[PDB]
Amino acid sequence: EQNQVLNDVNNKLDAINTMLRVYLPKLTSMLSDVMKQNYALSLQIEYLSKQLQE
Amino acid sequence: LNDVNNKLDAINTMLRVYLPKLTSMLSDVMKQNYALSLQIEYLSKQLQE
What we know:
Helix content of chain A: over 70%
Oligomer: part of a larger assembly
Number of helices of chain A: 1
Number of strands of chain A: 0
Radius of gyration of chain A: 24 Å
Strand content of chain A: under 5%
Protein name (chain A): Vegetative insecticidal protein
Structural class of chain A: mainly alpha
Largest interface: A-B, 29 and 27 residues
Distance between the termini of chain A: 80 Å
Largest sheet of chain A: none
Order of helices and strands of chain A: H
C-alpha cells in the first residue's frame, strides 16, 4: 500500500508541477508586454503634451 | 508519507485554482491598456481638430 500511495503522490505532484512550469512563463511574458504597453502609453501622452504646447 | 501526500495535494490544488485567475487578470489588464490607447488616439484626433 505504501509503494502505491507513493506512486500516486509522485504522479499527482509531477503533473501539477509541470502545469505550474507551463503557466509561470506565460505570466512573466504577459507582465513584460504590459510594461511595454504602459511605456507606449507614456509616449502617446508625451505626444499629446507636445500637441497642447503647440 | 500520508501527511506529505495530503499537504502537497491540498497546496497544489490551491495553486491550480489560483494561476488561471492571474492569467485572466493579466489578459484583461492588457485589453484595458488597449482601450486606453484607443482613448488617447481619440484625444489626439480631438486636438488635431
